[PDB]
C-alpha cells in the first residue's frame, strides 16, 4: 500500500512510520514545508502509525533528539513516539477490508488529515488548534497538547482496568476534534475502507 506523507505546515517536521516492534518503509524522514514523502507499507499491516515529529536534532548517523514524538531518539523509527503525538492509525487487508482512524489518546501535536487516495471510503481530519485552546493543565512544556493518560496515570484516564467513561479531559479533544478519538473506549470513529486502499497523510491540511 502507498502513503504519500505532505507537510502542508509552515515548519518543518519529521514524519514516523511505525507498527510499534518495527519501522514501516524507512521508519522516518525530514519534510520541510510543502515536501511529500511517500511509503511503501507491506499489506496486512496490523497496528500500524503514522506521526509528525516536531523540532529535532539529529547527528550524521540518525541519532538525536525530538520535542515531540520522539522515538527512542532514531531519525528512522522502530517503534512509537513519545507523546503528545497526533495519530493516524490503521489496519490493512483485515479480512478483506482496511480500517483507519485518528487518534487524540496519545495527545495532539500537529493537525492532520488522513484521507483515503483511492475509491471507496471517506477521510478522517483532526485540524483545530488543539495546541492554542489546549487545557493548562495538559500543556507540554516541550510543545503540542499531553493526553490525560500521560500527565496524571489514573485508571479512568489510562482505561486500565477497560472500564472508563468521558472525562473533562478527553470532552476537550472530542469537542475540537469530534471525528477523532478521544479516549480508549470513545465511540469509533473508524472507517472502512477497502482492502489495499492507498493514501494521503497531510499535516496542517488547513
Known amino acids: ?4 506523507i505532505v507537510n502542508r505546515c509552515s515548519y518543518t517536521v519529521w514524519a514516523a512510520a511505525s507498527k510499534g ?3 514501516l518503509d524507512a521508519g522516518g524522514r525530514q519534510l520541510n514545508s ?9 499489506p496486512g499491516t496490523n497496528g500500524g502509525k503514522i506521526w509528525a515529529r516536531t523540532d529535532c536534532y539529529f547527528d550524521d548517523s540518525g541519532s538525536g533528539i525530538c520535542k515531540t514524538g520522539d522515538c527512542g531518539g532514531l531519525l528512522r523509527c522502530k517503534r512509537f513516539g513519545r507523546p503528545p503525538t497526533t495519530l493516524a492509525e490503521f489496519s490493512l487487508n483485515q479480512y478483506g477490508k482496511d480500517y483507519i482512524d485518528i487518534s487524540n489518546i496519545k495527545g495532539f501535536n500537529v493537525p492532520m488529515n488522513f484521507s483515503p487516495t483511492t475509491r471507496g471510503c471517506r477521510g478522517v481530519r483532526c485540524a483545530a488548534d ?6 493548562a493543565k495538559l500543556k ?24 472508563c467513561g ?3 479531559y478527553s470532552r476537550f479533544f ?8 478521544s479516549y480508549v473506549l470513545d465511540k469509533p470513529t473508524t472507517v472502512t475502507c477497502p482492502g489495499s486502499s492507498n493514501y494521503r497523510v497531510t499535516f496542517c491540511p488547513t
Open 1 to 4: 500500500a502507498t502513503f504519500e
Open 140 to 163: 507540554a512544556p516541550g510543545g503540542g497538547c499531553n493526553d490525560a493518560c500521560t500527565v496524571f496515570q489514573t485508571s479512568e484516564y489510562c482505561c486500565t482496568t477497560g472500564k
Open 174 to 181: 472530542k469537542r475540537l476534534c469530534p471525528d477523532a478519538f
Open 34 to 42: 510543502g515536501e511529500s514523502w511517500t511509503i511503501n507499507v507491506e
Open 166 to 168: 468521558p472525562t473533562e
Open 130 to 135: 488543539i495546541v492554542g485552546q489546549c487545557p
Open 21 to 23: 516492534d518495527a519501522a
